[PDB]
Design a protein around this ligand. Structure first.
Ligand code: MG
Lengths: 288, 287
């Protein structure tokens, strides 16, 4: 019944910049076959911020027509208005998505817990009676919006069955450990690989993982089975030298032989040939 | 020249919906009191908090009420090429004077090359209709600085498409370089300390939050290039609080319209004590 392992699925682009939907679906099927319980579309690693509001509708519809069960799909929602967050969430939930991965709004800076509580509440009200299965996304290194333990408690208390978990990508164990003690009744999912297995052993329900795009079984052992893997921790450090999402895509290409993954959407830029060789070398030293 | 545009505040009802009547009346007041245009859905307008459907209804309502499209600028503050192009094309097709286009603001620490590619892709997607884009440099909010070099690249590649820059950095050495290197474009200045000086150096005006409640005073800076230390001193005061909620406090104070108090989450309304402080600071300078 736990959340388990979800791939933070990468989004492949053709040379003309459009989404390669067949390649995307095939990659999802591979990740599911290799140990993911679900795939998360349009998250950070998916460049979801860069995927249009019409594109995401086309992609979700195509995934469902291709026969991937909606209950094996999580959709990231990374927008700044109540209306758009509710609309995107409602559409995915109506389609049968397992969960929404909902970021707080990320335009205004230095926002208060009270402001955030009110925003989430307004989104949930706007979704309406069908609201369910929202995982709130704590990724302050990207959004510059922390979801405090206290805020998570306020949300859980007010919205039982609606706020069902937290994706904690803070890399702040002092925070994560409190999420587990106070809110481990929810699905507490852990972004920082060094504390993933540790957190699973303390009741964490898994991960929405970028590395799981190319080391699925290895991440599953951590996220589901609660087993450490120092090689994964080391890989993530070795890759700090490079933009995270473009480097993950380089390793999808390296492990699969699929050249499509090279390409990223602006405002990201391609990893250079020399830097790709460094990334592949770091991977090979650990896993090949 | 561009002149003075109000960075128009967006009024909300107690139930949270947009008070479109109050918004249009406020725009007419700002226009009548010295704005050449009004900018909808910018930072001061809480544009990030205005939904993709709401903005369409608001823009249609403005135009149906008889506000000239050539006196409307629309902020576009999204992170995807498709949505930036869709929103921009819609406003341009409706006859908006300009788009105020922010760079995407989810990913952090992005490169000039990535930004050039993003803007280029937006403009290609809009197509031949693309015109009158003001690129928005507000790094204190977006965490994305538009460098002088990037502005040059955009101007060179997209003449008539990239027609200006709204520089809200408050970084004079930056602004001064924009003016000196790219003053052939409409360089508009957000920092009040810098507005009149920049206008004297060839700046074309401002999209101004303070112009919601001190329109004539900002016009003398933005159009006539005259320093006003009172405005600078007031901005020092407004920067002690979340800026947009504090601006709204002063729209309420100067107009007697209570509606402006309310802000949309994730903002929170200014407290009664802080409101009296802001009003007192204003009164000490302007009343
Ligand atoms: Mg955004």
């Amino acid at each position: 019944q736990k959340f388990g392992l979800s791939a933070a699925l990468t989004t492949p682009f053709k040379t003309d910049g459009t989404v390669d939907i067949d390649a995307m679906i095939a990659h999802a099927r591979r990740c599911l076959s290799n140990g993911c319980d679900s795939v998360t579309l349009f998250g950070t690693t998916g460049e979801g911020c860069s995927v249009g509001s019409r594109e995401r509708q086309a992609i979700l519809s195509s995934f469902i027509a291709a026969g991937i069960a909606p209950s094996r799909i999580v959709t990231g929602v990374l927008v700044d208005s109540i209306e758009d967050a509710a609309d995107q969430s409602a559409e995915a939930l109506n389609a049968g998505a397992r969960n929404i991965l909902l970021a707080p709004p990320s335009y205004f800076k230095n926002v208060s817990d009270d402001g955030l509580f009110a925003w989430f509440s307004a989104v949930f009200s706007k979704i309406g009676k069908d609201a369910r299965d929202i995982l709130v996304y704590n990724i302050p290194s990207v959004t510059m919006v922390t979801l405090s333990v206290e805020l998570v408690g306020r949300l859980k208390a007010a919205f039982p069955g609606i706020v069902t978990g937290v994706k904690d990508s803070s890399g702040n164990w002092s925070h994560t450990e409190r999420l587990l003690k106070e809110h481990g009744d929810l699905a507490i999912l852990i972004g920082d690989e060094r504390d993933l297995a540790r957190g699973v052993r303390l009741g964490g329900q898994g991960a929405i993982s970028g590395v799981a795009n190319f080391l699925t079984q290895e991440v599953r052992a951590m996220a589901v089975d609660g087993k450490d893997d120092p090689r994964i921790v080391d890989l993530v450090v070795e890759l700090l030298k490079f933009p995270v999402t473009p480097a993950v895509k380089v390793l999808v290409s390296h492990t699969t032989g699929e050249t499509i993954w090279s390409d990223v959407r602006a405002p990201l830029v391609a990893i250079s040939p020399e830097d790709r060789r460094q990334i592949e070398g770091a991977f090979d030293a650990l896993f090949r």
